[PDB]
Amino acid sequence: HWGYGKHNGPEHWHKDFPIAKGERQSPVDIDTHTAKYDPSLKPLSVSYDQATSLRILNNGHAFNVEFDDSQDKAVLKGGPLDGTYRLIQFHFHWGSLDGQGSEHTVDKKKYAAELHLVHWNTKYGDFGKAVQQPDGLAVLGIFLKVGSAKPGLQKVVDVLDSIKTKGKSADFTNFDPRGLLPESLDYWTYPGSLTTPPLLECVTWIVLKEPISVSSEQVLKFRKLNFNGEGEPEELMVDNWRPAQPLKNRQIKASFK
Ligand SMILES: [C]C1=[C][C]=C([B]([O])([O])[O])[C]=[C]1
Ligand SMILES: [Zn+2]
């Protein structure tokens, strides 16, 4: 029964998920002055040309665009990673207002939203096994700011009417996630967690420095989604972000100077 409300939100999650107070929780504030350039990170490789999107789902917490992850089709490699990580889904976190919505922050700045491209390490065979390992997942995080429209997002925006409420899905084939990337792949990286329950400490985070721009109309449509199921009282799907957690004994590394 966790969620984002006053009585079931982030401050309550630790009761059912004690790892919420663990040693490598996400998100975090990225202090740009304290992050250290690491000249050894290897180049980062996003290989999405053969991606096969399948479906879009409103799961009651966000919406997921799901991919075929039964073969190496859309993979993330390089950067801080050893081995090959397959794209399983992407989703967003966003605010009720343009001045909040991101999970990570940059020098305490909040963005309007944050895109998470979720990948799992093929050495563990399936996603469910991967989330049980400290190097099971690699999540590419991309900030959204409100300005110019993002053309490659509009297909997502357009389908949201058909998945308004929890449990609804729609076909979503032939979507190209390359259309959601910024120009630069400069990034910060650190070891962390899932940002929702079960909050498992299985993620290598790779957060891009360059945001993407989306229009006010695009983010407005995200805010028309519902947390509730059909035929239940309407609760707008907004503010589905966890705030920054303690960094504890971690260092954030930068791929750039
Ligand atoms: C199952 C799952 C996958 C990814 C995430 B997140 O928000 O950390 O990308 C949370 C939960
Ligand atoms: Zn997420």
Residue 144, ligand 1, Cβ within 6 A: no
Report which bound ligand comes closest to the CA of 193: 1
| Separation CA 60–CA 167 (nearest Å) | 7
Residue 193, ligand 1, Cβ within 6 A: no
Smallest CA-to-CA distance from 177 within 130, 142, 227 is with 142
Ligand 1 mutation pick, 69, 94, 114, 139, max ligand atoms within 8 A of CB: 139
Q: Which residues are catalytic?
A: 61
Q: What does the domain layout of the chain look like in residue ranges?
A: 1-257
Count Cα atoms within 13 angstroms, Cβ side, for 211.
20
Query: Which residue is listed with tokens 């420095």?
Result: 209
- Distances from the Cα of 151 to the Cα of 87, 179, 181, 226, angstroms: 21, 7, 11, 24
Q: Which CATH number fits domain 1-257: 3.10.200.10, 3.40.1390.10, 3.40.47.10, 3.90.1150.10?
A: 3.10.200.10
